[model samples]
Target: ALSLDQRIQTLAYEELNKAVEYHQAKAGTVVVLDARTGEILALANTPGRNRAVTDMIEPGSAIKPFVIAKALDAGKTDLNERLNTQPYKIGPSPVRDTHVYPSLDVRGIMQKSSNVGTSKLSARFGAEEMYDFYHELGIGVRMHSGFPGETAGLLRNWRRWRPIEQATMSFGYGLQLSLLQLARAYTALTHDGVLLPLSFEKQAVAPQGKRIFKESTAREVRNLMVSVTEPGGTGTAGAVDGFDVGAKTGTARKKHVATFIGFAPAKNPRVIVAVTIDEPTAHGYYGGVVAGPPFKKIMGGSLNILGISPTKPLT
Candidate 1:
């Protein structure tokens, strides 16, 4: 009776379970949102735990876009600014890439999911600046979702952060957050740099959002994300056929959590989908591999369910 579209919600739940079963994951969760209004279109958690609201997990590379977007907005970096991609260390801890990228521009860095590149770019900001940006994104804030046992997660104060901790936090480590909050963070990206509060019930009107970044900054970041679902990007598996999908993937080991989060029709998003598979012991663990296919299914299905027109010619 609320805002959720039954058909898309059903599809989302089914895909989440199927992904968990197929990958032998202990649990999975998915959140689908109306990109413009912040209405949660579909939310599902397997095994009935609703861990999306309660469990804090590392987001891995999925957080790169946010860090880089803030950097771009602060004039700390630009889309054309190139940075070294080689594995490097911030003090005793190492920041490495899975592939040898040599060097990548800001856009290329995101597409490549380069930890080294992200850390280098973020180094342009002071600890206070970075912490403030993440704080505004609602990293540690409880969302008041009316769900029992919702967690606010953890974002340590900037004053206590060492250089290594700050560097690691740049690429989404040294902090934790619920999958729900992680998904909500992207609202800023999808909502024209405005952070809209999420709603479970149908909103009579589009709620006002807090301005987080310049509209241009959000659009540019969205544009960069499009490349992640196109060829030669880690998240290509999450692509929807005619719509330009903008997304990022995350993979963290040690009880491996894989995540895929994004919106469709990049130029004019209608839906945002976030997926997470926890503790997958079989198949693949990388988010782009484990979560991407389900993300593709859910996002593509939701667009069709909503009668959203394709943004580009059918591929």
Candidate 2:
């Protein structure tokens, strides 16, 4: 016979373990956390390794927000500034838009996942500044979770950057990071320029955030992110029925990893979500088409379960 509290704890743990087992069987990774408290509700991964914590991979265009945010923070560019979209040479190698498109502004570049646009911005801003910005946003840093085999990601010394590397790195190639690292870094924008610490086990002390940007910048970026799900935006199909979601879609070549990372409710963000599908062999390889739909489904369900109503009525 167990005490009342002990019985409740046992049942909760058992249910959680069962849920983890189910996801493990599905060859997917899942991580649920309380964004406000930094409490990890659950973490599961299967197939290759526990990628929720370990296993670093290129984040693809999922890294765009950080670069864009950095550019905004440093006064390198404005949200409406026009960025060239023409095919350009990156150290003898031509880099062009993944899809045929015209020139774009900073917001349009982010909404469309314009690799060439981001690379051009990086070139104007300088790779060294971008490197420091990433560090400021908590990239290439370890989480306090103490998860086994976690990685801080690969950030080479800025002095060693080649032109191509600098360009690709701006849009999330030439670098590698665990999923958790990417998630934590995005906390800068999601939490209003505050980057919070992560945890796997229960924390006795409350998590404090280090401010990385002004609230105004965070709000501007949030607006730009929401526009990504509008018509003609990369994640138009990712929109939910009742929530205004802000997301960025990413597809990296070579390994064919597709990812979506963003927050919900443009005005007041409540959840930060990231989804990645490895080596998708489907007809379409774009992140907006492949990963966006599933991300919307999962995020919608999760938000409903948490009982967070949308601020605006969704169409």
Q: Specify the poorest-scoring 10-residue window by lDDT in model 1.
A: 84-93
User: Which model scores highest in lDDT?
Assistant: 1
Please provide, for model 1 over 1-315, each residue's C-alpha lDDT reduced to its tens digit, 9 standing for 90 to 100: 487778888998899989999999889999999999999898888977789898888888888998888888889888677887888775677878888888899889888888888888888899998898888888888998888888988899999999988888888887888887888888899989998888888998889889998999999999999989989888998999889999999988767889999998898888999999998888898898999999999999999999999877986
Clashes of each: 0, 0
Candidate 2 wrong stretches, greater than 4 Å: 1-27, 201-206, 282-284
lDDT of 2 at 205: 58
- Clash pairs for candidate 1: none
Which candidate gets the maximum TM-score versus the true structure?
Answer: 1
Q: Over the stretch 230-256, how does candidate 2's per-residue lDDT look in tens digits?
A: 887778867877877778887767646
Candidate 1: lDDT of 44? 88
